[PDB]
Amino acid sequence: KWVIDPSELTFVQEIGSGQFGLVHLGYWLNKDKVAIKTIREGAMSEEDFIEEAEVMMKLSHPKLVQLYGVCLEQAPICLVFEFMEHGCLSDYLRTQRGLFAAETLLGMCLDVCEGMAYLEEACVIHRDLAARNCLVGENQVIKVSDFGMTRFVLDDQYTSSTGTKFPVKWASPEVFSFSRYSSKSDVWSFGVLMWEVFSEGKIPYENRSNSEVVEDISTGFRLYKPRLASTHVYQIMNHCWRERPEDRPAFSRLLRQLAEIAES
């Protein structure tokens, strides 16, 4: 069962501040060390979230951050996750910039691709795959997290394609135009994530506003090759950024292609 009783949790140390509240390091009774995220009331549709717990709890892969359960006795509710000792991938790339071998960056892309190929096979769409949503664990392993979360987010400025805070930088054209989500729109976000990894955590389209990204992408602009990305890696990146979702490789195809490059 996904319901965790407040007596089954102990908060040990404040890790930091998330978007919707606080993140703590804690222990889960008779189980493991955990990361506990406290969610501010009004931030998410708790009822819609709770409804999908039975089905969603079954998703498990070595490259996906495990969400152990939800503490919902009293407001604010808590989300109990697998503890990822090195934090988010975006901050990790940024602080370790200049210390990454090209093979390590490719391996990080491979970890995310494998996690996404599992979600794609399970018919689960992430919707907002980005380095900020990926976590770094034991021995630099990368795990995908927060998949499907934007379906519960109550801030219309983030969820609506015309929203002031819409994550347009990771959006495929059918997503930014019509909110037409698929594993193929996740493939486009994966390409941007590959660019983020190979650029050692640089922000994509830093010099552009939301409508400028939409105009550039619609007119054929694509993110420049990062210095650390080989031409073969950049070709894969461009394949993720094909205008038509049908022309984009599936995650199962990307995984074979990226593994062949890594293993030589």
Ligand X SMILES: COc1ccc2cccc(-n3cc(NC(N)=O)c(C(N)=O)n3)c2c1
Contact region with ligand X (CB under 6 A), list: 64-72, 107-115, 205-213, 239-247: 64-72
- In the bound state with ligand X, the residue whose beta carbon lies nearer, of 111 and 213, is 111
| Residue 146 interacts with ligand X (CB under 6 A): yes or no | yes
Identity of the residue, 83 or 100, whose beta carbon is nearer to ligand X in the bound complex: 83
Strand-pairing partners, residue 10, are 27
Which of 91, 89, 95, 85 is CA-nearest to residue 109? 89
CB 6 within 8 A of CB 74: yes
250 binds ligand X (CB under 6 A): no
Instruction: Confirm or reject binding of residue 67 to ligand X (CB under 6 A).
Output: yes
Count of other CB atoms within 10 angstroms of residue 69: 22
Q: Confirm if 63 and 111 have CB atoms less than 8 A apart.
A: yes
Out of 28, 81, 181, 188, the residue judged to bind ligand X by CB under 6 A = 81
87 binds ligand X (CB under 6 A): yes
Shortest distance (Å) from residue 18 CB to ligand X: 6
Q: Which is nearer to ligand X, 88 or 93 (CB)?
A: 88
15 near 83, Cβ under 8 Å? no
**Cβ–Cβ < 8 Å for 43, 56:** no
Q: What SS3 class is residue 56?
A: helix
Q: Which residues define the annotated binding site?
A: 15-23, 37
Task: Output DSSP code: residue 86.
Answer: T
> 2 or 11, CB closer to ligand X?
2
Check if 128 is active-site: yes
Identify the active-site residue in 111, 128, 146, 186: 128
Our finding on whether 122 is near ligand X (CB under 6 A) is no
Helix (H, G, I), strand (E, B) or coil at 81: strand
Query: Which residues share a beta bridge with 135?
Result: 88, 143
Task: Find the part of the chain contacting ligand X (CB under 6 A) among 58-66, 175-183, 192-200, 248-256.
Answer: 58-66
Catalytically annotated residues? 128
